[PDB]
Structure formats: C-alpha cells, structure tokens
Amino acid sequence: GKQCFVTGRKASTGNRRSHALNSTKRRWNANLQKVRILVDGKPKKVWVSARALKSGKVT
Amino acid sequence: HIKKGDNVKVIAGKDKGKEGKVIATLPKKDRVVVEGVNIMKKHQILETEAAIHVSNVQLLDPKTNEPTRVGYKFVDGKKVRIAKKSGEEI
Amino acid sequence: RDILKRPVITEKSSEAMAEDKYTFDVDTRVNKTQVKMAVEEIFNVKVASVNIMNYKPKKKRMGRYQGYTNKRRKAIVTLKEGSDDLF
Amino acid sequence: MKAKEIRDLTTSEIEEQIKSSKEELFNLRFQLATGQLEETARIRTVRKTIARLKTVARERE
RNA sequence: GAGCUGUAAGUAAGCUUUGAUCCAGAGAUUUCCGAAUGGGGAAACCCAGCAUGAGUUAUGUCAUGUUAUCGAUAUGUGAAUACAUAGCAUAUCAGAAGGCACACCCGGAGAACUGAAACAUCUUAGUACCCGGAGGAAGAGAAAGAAAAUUCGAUUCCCUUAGUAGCGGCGAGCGAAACGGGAAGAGCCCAAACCAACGUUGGGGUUGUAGGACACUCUAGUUACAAAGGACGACAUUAGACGAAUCAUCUGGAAAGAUGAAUCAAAGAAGGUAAUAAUCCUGUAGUCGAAAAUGUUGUCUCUCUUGAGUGGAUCCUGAGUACGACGGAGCACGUGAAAUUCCGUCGGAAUCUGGGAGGACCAUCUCCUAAGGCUAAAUACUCUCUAGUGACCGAUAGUGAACCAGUACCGUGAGGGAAAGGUGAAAAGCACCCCGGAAGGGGAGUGAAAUAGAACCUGAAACCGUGUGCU
RNA sequence: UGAGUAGCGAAAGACGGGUGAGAAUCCCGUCCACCGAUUGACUAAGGUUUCCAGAGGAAGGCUCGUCCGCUCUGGGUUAGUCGGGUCCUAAGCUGAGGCCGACAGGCGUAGGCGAUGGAUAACAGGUUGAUAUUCCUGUACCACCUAUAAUCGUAUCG
Known part of the structure; x- marks a missing residue:
C-alpha cells in the first residue's frame, strides 16, 4: 500500500523473458524515497518518488 | 346466486322436475340443500337429505310457476333481482 | 402486574397447601423478587419466601410430526398470613 | 369496521385499562385453569376491547 | 350483500342485514438475535453507568430515554518548547458500515488439464477461481479522425467486406479494419491573455474556412448534459358491476349422447356440472365504474439569459508534458523493415514561419489541433409483478423436490442427498347378528358396482400354494 | 437357490402359590449358586426425559412374554452459605492509535477475554412414587439498610 504522494506512482506487473522465451511474472517498482516535505499541519515524512x-x- | 329459503325446480338428477324449498347454502363448495330430494341413509340408522349442485336448480317464476333465469335492472338505488322471459320482480 | 399466568393444581401441590404453599406459573424472564411483589398487590397477602425453578421443552409427537412443548417456569410461594382461596 | 363508541376523555382511558385488562381478563383465566368457566367466547371479547382502547389512545398521542 | 371463526376433522361456547366473514388503497403496535453499535460472549445470553419516574420507615427491586468506531463542521485546547503545533473533553450530521439475482458491465491479479498425435516458442486463454467499484443499464463519445473523390464529418449496435489482407517452431493454429447498406441521432462547459478590490472571489473567453483578449460606429425558462428549489388537469395501475339464446322421448344410477322440433351470436375462448353442452353455472365479445395512494403526460406559473462582421502592433491557447534510450505489455500483427499507444528507470523540446498524422525514415502535398471535464437513444441480462402461447413431460418422465424437500439420512467440518400421487358423483366410511382377549372373517345394510372397504381406479411377469385329464 | 441349513454374543438354577385366553422366560416366598482393590457406593465429561404412577401388546427385544431403557395418559428437578457469574490472573485469543502489505489482509502497544490454579459465609436429623448442605425441625454464620443509646468531634475513612 505504498504510493507516491505528489504524483501517484505505483508498482506494475509484467513478464521476465529468457533466451528461450520462457516467461515468468515480475514487478516494476517505483523509486520512492522517504522525504520530509511541507505540510499544512506538522511537517511529516511521506513516500515521494x-x-x-x-x-x-x-x- | 341462489339464496336460501327460495322455491326452485330440479332440472337434472334422480329427483328431476320436483319442486322444493332451499334450506341450507354452502357457497365454498357451491352446494345447495333442497328439501325433499336426494335422501341419504347413514349407519350411526337415520334418513336425512344430501346436497345437490347449484347448477341443477332454477328459480320458479312467481306468476307462471315455471323455471327461468335471473337478471338485474336497478329499479331503485339498490339492486333487485328480476326474471327472464318476463318482467316480474322476484 | 400480570406476572403470574396460571395456578398449578397437582397431586404434589395438594399436600403443599397444608403448609400454605401455592404453586403458580410465572413469566419466563422474571425473578422471584418480582413475583414476591406481585402476590402482595393482587390478593393483599403478606408473603414469607418464594422458590422458583426452570424446566425444559419435551419432545411430544402426535400423528406423524414431531415437535417440542414450551419451556415452563414454576414458582412456589409461602404465606405466613391469609389465604389465596383458589376455587 | 367495528363499534368505535369509545369517545370519552383521555383521563378515563387509563381507568378503562385496569378494569378491562387487570381484573377482568386476569380473573377469567384463573377460572378456566381450575375449570369453572362457561361462556368461553368472552375471553376473545375482552381482548379485542383492549386493542381498541389502546388504538384510540395512540391516535391522540 | 349472508353467512362466518384457515388447512382440520370433531365437540363446545359464540358473532352477523344496526352490514359477520371476504377484496383493494391508507394508518398504528411490532419480543429477542443478527452490520449489532454500553461492556462481554460458545447468536437468539450475561453483566453496567448517567437522567427522570413507580413501590419500601430504608437498602434490595422495576419502567422509560441515552452511552460503539471512523470521518466532516464550529469552541476550550500547558506539552518536550517563547508564540505554536501532536495528544485531548464536548456540540451537531437520513455521513460510512452490512446484504442482495452466484444474470448483465468496468478495473486489480491471474492457472492447469488439453492441441501441436512427444515438447520448451505457440495454444488452452486473458478462460476458470479470487478481490474492488457501481448502475438499471455499464463502458465509449464531439477528430492532433478516415481517406486520395470535381470527398466525409462525435460515439454505439446489426449485415457485408471475409475466412480476404495478414500473423505463425510460417507448424498446430490465430485473424482485422476502411468503404457500402440500416437502427438511433442534440451538443456544451472550464485554464491563459484583460478588467477593480483585498493570492481569493465576480465578469470575459473556448478555436483550424485559425479562434480569442485589445482597439473598432454596433440587439430562446430547455431541471437527460448545457445553472439550480417549487406551484397549474388528462390518461395508467392498485378492489369491481351489467352483459343474448332450449324444450320433449329412448338407454342408463345419473344425459351434456341419440331421435325431433326452436333461439341467440361484435358472445362457437376456456373451466365445472352424476357421461361428450353456443342457449345449466362461473365466464367470454361490448360498455361502465375510483374514496385514497402511486406513475406518465401538456397549458399556464416560477427560476436564468448580450444578439451580429471587416483590422490582426503587441499578448494568450494546458511542461517535467510530447519525445528518445533500456526492460515489458497491448494493437489480428510472436521486436520483426513495426508506424499507431500504455506502464517502470533515466535524459528531455518548440510556441502559429508553432505542433501532430497519412505503417521504418527524408522531402513535397493533404488532413487535423494532444498533454482539463460532463452527455440521453439505438445495445446486453432476468430473483421478481400482470396477461398469454407450444406438432414440450405426464409420476423410473418433468426442477433434486406434483406429498409441509434442501426435509429424512450420512459426516468433526466444508459438503452430499432420497423414496412416497389416484375409493366413489355424493362419506352416503358397513346400524344390527355370530366365532376372540384382540386382529380378522361370514351374514345383513349403503352404493350402478364392496375382489370400489381407506395397505382402496385397471392389475402383466418373475415367484409361492390347491384340485384335476394323460404319463 | 443355498435351506428349514449356519448362528442365536463368556456364566447355575430348582420347586410351591398367583395373574392370565394363552407361562421354562411375568410377580411373591424358600433353597442353592457368583463378585466382593469390586458385577458394591459417589461423581467429572458426554447423552438429553431414557426418571415416577396407571393402562396396552401391532412393531423393537436374536426364542416366548401378562414384562421392559418399547406405545398411551398424566406427574417429577425448590439454595444468601454447594459448582460457575456480579472477584483475580496462566498458556493462548483479540487488540483504540500505530507499522507493513497489488486487493483481500499480516503483526503489534495501552486495554480486554480466557481455569485445569488463587480468594470466598452451615451443620445434624426426618420426610415422598419420583427432590434434598435446596423442603421441614433445631441450632449458626457473612454482607447491607433503618431509630434512641455507651464512648465521641484530631476522632474516623483513604
């Protein structure tokens, strides 16, 4: 349940292929970082890509 | 359709063409009891009367004393019963 | 109130009348303190103590269909003065 | 469609509950338990009066 | 408008023309569990606080209201830490929860058996199963389109193109679109340039034959989109009422059958009547009827509303966007000469002399104007409500279930899952006599029939017994 | 069909009198026989009316039955002190906020639920066909409420 707060980036799903073209399921993850940003209330730490x-x- | 305490003539059955007086009414089963017809014997041993179908009896004309049908014409504000083949009110 | 439902007249209750003990059928969801305060206002009798017991439904079959009776709550009341005068 | 003759004041409505219910229906049931009661159709008659009494009472809130 | 208190008998005691029982619209009461919501719990149970009230000299006891969690709005709101901001205690909210037709629709995630006569690319198949979100329909939808004509003009669905062009260990196999013929068919609103307040709220403005701001002489309520609350009479449902016409004889327990004579028909559909009925009953064709509730519709109310073209100094027209590389997915199209479009990572443009597309790519022509948002109709499906039909079944058939069947019964549990219809027209269900302790039987009687006696319509075979002609 | 064949599930019964249509099998009495660290007496789990009385003999009882844990009609379980709750917590379960995770959800703090353990006020006798620390008789104990009082206004409760 992790997603980019500014844009909304999220992980995807796809296939991993070999030289013989055998396919297995894999996931592409987003380059999220835990960074403190300006918030209306307390400055909190959120996931931002x-x-x-x-x-x-x-x- | 056929109220109790009336004068009817039987047109079908063992006791056909025999006038009688209606003494009971069973509308759930559509059965009418006529006095003097359809005698039964029950081992209890007594002799009483049995029920006959409402479709085997016709009302008697007040004047001719002959079987006839029934109609309505709304003579008054209420509803009254008349007889076909004539105009006399039953 | 109408907590009491019916009086009980049995062979065991007949010998319990000699000790001024009366058997009644009460509501299922009442306590004997409520039953204590119900006799005093209907018959105007001062009571001494109240016992109470519960039963279970009985499987009784008539014809072809099986079923159960109602659960019964029975109370025995002891009187120090007066008499209920059941007819 | 019954006889809704009950039109008296609301204060007398409460008077008609303890009479009809508390002392009449209650007495009629103990009479039958030991067994002394003929005219058993009266049990239903008292019960329906109580239903009518509380219906008109709710109509007046 | 005369009987009634359901199946269900049967016996009591009752109600009803002063309108019982029944049909329809509208109201009131509605125990406990269950999202279950005061706390707990092995559902249908146990245990409390707060505020009033009923009874006790007083406690004990009882009744009525309220007290869950999360979220959104006002107020009071030290912290650590000066002002503050996390936590907190109150007040309000037809705010949310759970189920539902294992039908239709859109997303996330996503097999294997099987075929290729083995098998790994491929196929099965984006199918089965699971999760999420809705709606009565959903999804798509107003050209950065299709194409090459002296063109068309939003989306959706049916026919044809066509098993064509293509894809493919070029094997098995997969498989289109445009044109053309039809159903249905309306299009609009926002960001920016500009204008006055204190970045906010109003006006202006929505585009390709290029539109607008700016300067120029410049006038149709569409509540299904296009802005959002209400008042005006006609049909349709939810009870019903009138509504034509037949008499004899024979058989028979009974006539509707047969033999003869009549009538009606905007009515010869059907069901029941002691047997096969247009004229015996309920009905049918036709017409009429509505307190009250609920839908649709159309004539005024009511609520909004700036209608037209020449000039283009200058300015505006959607940015980490389009696009590229790497690794994938989807387009009928398996990376292949792969255009067109989506996701992850990293780089990264231009501003009408602009930008995109026309199947790699460049030039010329043609068409269009992305990176913001809504929109009815033609289309798909049936747990239910009313009215109908069939060269569909007739009790081993038809739903598993024509009988109180998801019941008996089997299993710790998820779960599996039966067999059983028929007296007679009418109960008229054998009064009475004889054998017993009773079951049963023989007479009598009811009935057309009792070998139709409730283990009851007809009553085949296997199989079991008695007596006889020949051996 | 096998076929009136296999079997009828550890074991000692005999006689007298009754009931009855019908008795080796049912009642009453006598004798003999078997267990007795148990075939005797209580109670936890589990079953849920099989418990009592009066009637009955189709089916159930591996035979018969006048009998029954079987059929019909009526009855039977009584608590301030016994076991559990209005007391307490093991091992485990669930957890406001909070952390993690395509969805569904996983874990976990404060806090709760949870005895097989801890704390806690009663004994003896009698009575029915069926109840007995429960009913009755006699003698006790624990908590709470109400009106005068000995002693008490620095007491007293926490």
Whole structure:
C-alpha cells in the first residue's frame, strides 16, 4: 500500500523473458524515497518518488 | 346466486322436475340443500337429505310457476333481482 | 402486574397447601423478587419466601410430526398470613 | 369496521385499562385453569376491547 | 350483500342485514438475535453507568430515554518548547458500515488439464477461481479522425467486406479494419491573455474556412448534459358491476349422447356440472365504474439569459508534458523493415514561419489541433409483478423436490442427498347378528358396482400354494 | 437357490402359590449358586426425559412374554452459605492509535477475554412414587439498610 504522494506512482506487473522465451511474472517498482516535505499541519515524512522531487519541490 | 329459503325446480338428477324449498347454502363448495330430494341413509340408522349442485336448480317464476333465469335492472338505488322471459320482480 | 399466568393444581401441590404453599406459573424472564411483589398487590397477602425453578421443552409427537412443548417456569410461594382461596 | 363508541376523555382511558385488562381478563383465566368457566367466547371479547382502547389512545398521542 | 371463526376433522361456547366473514388503497403496535453499535460472549445470553419516574420507615427491586468506531463542521485546547503545533473533553450530521439475482458491465491479479498425435516458442486463454467499484443499464463519445473523390464529418449496435489482407517452431493454429447498406441521432462547459478590490472571489473567453483578449460606429425558462428549489388537469395501475339464446322421448344410477322440433351470436375462448353442452353455472365479445395512494403526460406559473462582421502592433491557447534510450505489455500483427499507444528507470523540446498524422525514415502535398471535464437513444441480462402461447413431460418422465424437500439420512467440518400421487358423483366410511382377549372373517345394510372397504381406479411377469385329464 | 441349513454374543438354577385366553422366560416366598482393590457406593465429561404412577401388546427385544431403557395418559428437578457469574490472573485469543502489505489482509502497544490454579459465609436429623448442605425441625454464620443509646468531634475513612 505504498504510493507516491505528489504524483501517484505505483508498482506494475509484467513478464521476465529468457533466451528461450520462457516467461515468468515480475514487478516494476517505483523509486520512492522517504522525504520530509511541507505540510499544512506538522511537517511529516511521506513516500515521494524521485521523479516528483525533480522540477523543484520543497523539503 | 341462489339464496336460501327460495322455491326452485330440479332440472337434472334422480329427483328431476320436483319442486322444493332451499334450506341450507354452502357457497365454498357451491352446494345447495333442497328439501325433499336426494335422501341419504347413514349407519350411526337415520334418513336425512344430501346436497345437490347449484347448477341443477332454477328459480320458479312467481306468476307462471315455471323455471327461468335471473337478471338485474336497478329499479331503485339498490339492486333487485328480476326474471327472464318476463318482467316480474322476484 | 400480570406476572403470574396460571395456578398449578397437582397431586404434589395438594399436600403443599397444608403448609400454605401455592404453586403458580410465572413469566419466563422474571425473578422471584418480582413475583414476591406481585402476590402482595393482587390478593393483599403478606408473603414469607418464594422458590422458583426452570424446566425444559419435551419432545411430544402426535400423528406423524414431531415437535417440542414450551419451556415452563414454576414458582412456589409461602404465606405466613391469609389465604389465596383458589376455587 | 367495528363499534368505535369509545369517545370519552383521555383521563378515563387509563381507568378503562385496569378494569378491562387487570381484573377482568386476569380473573377469567384463573377460572378456566381450575375449570369453572362457561361462556368461553368472552375471553376473545375482552381482548379485542383492549386493542381498541389502546388504538384510540395512540391516535391522540 | 349472508353467512362466518384457515388447512382440520370433531365437540363446545359464540358473532352477523344496526352490514359477520371476504377484496383493494391508507394508518398504528411490532419480543429477542443478527452490520449489532454500553461492556462481554460458545447468536437468539450475561453483566453496567448517567437522567427522570413507580413501590419500601430504608437498602434490595422495576419502567422509560441515552452511552460503539471512523470521518466532516464550529469552541476550550500547558506539552518536550517563547508564540505554536501532536495528544485531548464536548456540540451537531437520513455521513460510512452490512446484504442482495452466484444474470448483465468496468478495473486489480491471474492457472492447469488439453492441441501441436512427444515438447520448451505457440495454444488452452486473458478462460476458470479470487478481490474492488457501481448502475438499471455499464463502458465509449464531439477528430492532433478516415481517406486520395470535381470527398466525409462525435460515439454505439446489426449485415457485408471475409475466412480476404495478414500473423505463425510460417507448424498446430490465430485473424482485422476502411468503404457500402440500416437502427438511433442534440451538443456544451472550464485554464491563459484583460478588467477593480483585498493570492481569493465576480465578469470575459473556448478555436483550424485559425479562434480569442485589445482597439473598432454596433440587439430562446430547455431541471437527460448545457445553472439550480417549487406551484397549474388528462390518461395508467392498485378492489369491481351489467352483459343474448332450449324444450320433449329412448338407454342408463345419473344425459351434456341419440331421435325431433326452436333461439341467440361484435358472445362457437376456456373451466365445472352424476357421461361428450353456443342457449345449466362461473365466464367470454361490448360498455361502465375510483374514496385514497402511486406513475406518465401538456397549458399556464416560477427560476436564468448580450444578439451580429471587416483590422490582426503587441499578448494568450494546458511542461517535467510530447519525445528518445533500456526492460515489458497491448494493437489480428510472436521486436520483426513495426508506424499507431500504455506502464517502470533515466535524459528531455518548440510556441502559429508553432505542433501532430497519412505503417521504418527524408522531402513535397493533404488532413487535423494532444498533454482539463460532463452527455440521453439505438445495445446486453432476468430473483421478481400482470396477461398469454407450444406438432414440450405426464409420476423410473418433468426442477433434486406434483406429498409441509434442501426435509429424512450420512459426516468433526466444508459438503452430499432420497423414496412416497389416484375409493366413489355424493362419506352416503358397513346400524344390527355370530366365532376372540384382540386382529380378522361370514351374514345383513349403503352404493350402478364392496375382489370400489381407506395397505382402496385397471392389475402383466418373475415367484409361492390347491384340485384335476394323460404319463 | 443355498435351506428349514449356519448362528442365536463368556456364566447355575430348582420347586410351591398367583395373574392370565394363552407361562421354562411375568410377580411373591424358600433353597442353592457368583463378585466382593469390586458385577458394591459417589461423581467429572458426554447423552438429553431414557426418571415416577396407571393402562396396552401391532412393531423393537436374536426364542416366548401378562414384562421392559418399547406405545398411551398424566406427574417429577425448590439454595444468601454447594459448582460457575456480579472477584483475580496462566498458556493462548483479540487488540483504540500505530507499522507493513497489488486487493483481500499480516503483526503489534495501552486495554480486554480466557481455569485445569488463587480468594470466598452451615451443620445434624426426618420426610415422598419420583427432590434434598435446596423442603421441614433445631441450632449458626457473612454482607447491607433503618431509630434512641455507651464512648465521641484530631476522632474516623483513604
């Protein structure tokens, strides 16, 4: 139940392939980081992806 | 349809063409008891009367004393019963 | 109130009348303190002590269908004065 | 469709509950338990009066 | 408008023309458990606080209201730590919970048996199972479209294109779209440039034949989208009422059958009547009827409302967006010469001389204007309510269940799962006599029939007994 | 069909008198026989009316039955002190906030639930066909409420 607070990034699902084309299930996870950001109330620590931290966000 | 305490004529059965007086009414089973017809014997031993179907009796005309059908015409505010083949009120 | 339902007249209760003990059928969900205060206001009799017991439904079959009777609560009341005068 | 003759004041309604219920229906049941009661159709008659009495009482809130 | 207190007998005691019983609309009461919600618990139980009240000289005892959790709104709200902000105690909320038709729809996650006459790519199959969210329908929907004509113009569904073009250990196999013919068919609102207050709320503005701000002389309530609450009479449901026409004889227990004579029909559909009935009964064709509740509709109320084109100095038209690389998925299309579009990681543009597409890619032409949001109809399905039909079954059949069947019974449990219909038209269900302790039987009697006697319509075979002609 | 065949589940019965339509099998009495660290007396779990009285003999009883744990009709279980709750906690279970996790959910703090353990006021005798620390008789104990009082306003409760 972990997701990016700014954008909403979440893990996905797909296949892992081999040279013989055998397929098994795997997951692509988001590069979430535990960073303190500005909040209206207490400044709390939330999951924010590294892409969201680009373009300029508070910390 | 056929009220109790009336004068009827039997048109079908063992005792056909015999006038009688209605003494009981069973509308759940559609059975009418006529006085003097359909005698029964019960081992208890007594002789009494049995029930007959309402479809085997016709009302008697007050004037001709002949079988007839029934109709309604709303003479008054209430509803009254008349007789076909004539105009006399039953 | 109408806590009491019916009086009980049996062979064992007949010999219990000599000791001023009366048997009644009461409501299932009442305590003997409530039964104590119900006799005093209907017959105007001062009571001494009240006993009470519970029963279980009995499986009674008539014809082809089986079933159960009602659960019964029975109370025995002891009187120091007066008499209920059951007819 | 019955005889709804009960039209007296609300104070007398409570007077008609202890009479009809507390002392009449209760007495009629102990009479039958030992067994002295003919006219057993009266048990239903008293019960329906109590239903009518409390129905008009609720109509007046 | 005359009987009634259900199956269910039967005996009591009752009610009813001063309108019983019954049918329909509208109200009141509604124990306990169960999301269960004062606390606990082995559901249908136990144990409390607070505020009034009923009884006791007084405790004991009882009745009525309220007290769960989370969330959203006002107030009081030291901390550690100066102001504050976590925690907290109150007040309010038709706020949420759980079930439901194992039907229809949209998402997350997602097999194997099987086929390839073995098998791993492939297929089964994005199927079965599970979880989440709804709705009466859901989803999609107003061109960064289809194409190559001297063009069309939102989405959805049916026919055809067509088993074509294609994909494929090029094996097994998978498999389209545009055009064309039809059902149905309305389109609008926001961000920015600009204008005055204290970043906020109002006005302005919504686009490709390029639109708008800015300067220029400049006038249809659509409550299914397009802005949101209410008042005005006509049909339709939820009880019903009128409504034509037949008499004789024969057989028979009984006539509706047969022999003869009549009638009606906007009514010859059907069911019941002692047997096969247009004219015996309930009905049918036709017409009429509504206190009261609930739907649809249409004529006024009511609530909003700025209707047109030439000029383009300058400004605005959606950014970590489009796009690229790496690893995947989905398009009929298995990375392949793969365009078109989604996810994870990392880089990362331009601003009408702009940008995207026309199956790698470049140039020329043609079409269009992404990165914000809503929208009825044609379409799919049936647990239920009313009215109907069948070259569909007729008790080993038809639902597992025509009988009080998800019952008996079996298992710790999830779960599995039967057999059983028929007297007679009418109970008229054998008064009475004889054998016993009774069951049963022989007479008499009821009935057309009693070998129709309730283990009751007909009553085959296997099988079991008695007597006889020939051996 | 096997076939009136196998079997009828450890074991000692005999006689007299009654009931009765019907008795080796039912009642009453006598004698003999068997267990007696148990086939005797209580009670926990489990079963749920099989317990008592009066009637009955279709089916059940591996035979018969006048009998029964079987059928019909009526009856039977009484607590301030006994075991449990209004007392307490083991091992475990559930947990407001909180942590983790595609969904569903997993774990866990404060706090609760939970005896097989701890704490806690009664004995003797009699009585019915069926109840007995429960009913009755006699003698006790524990908690709580109400009105004068000995002694008490620094007491006293915590």
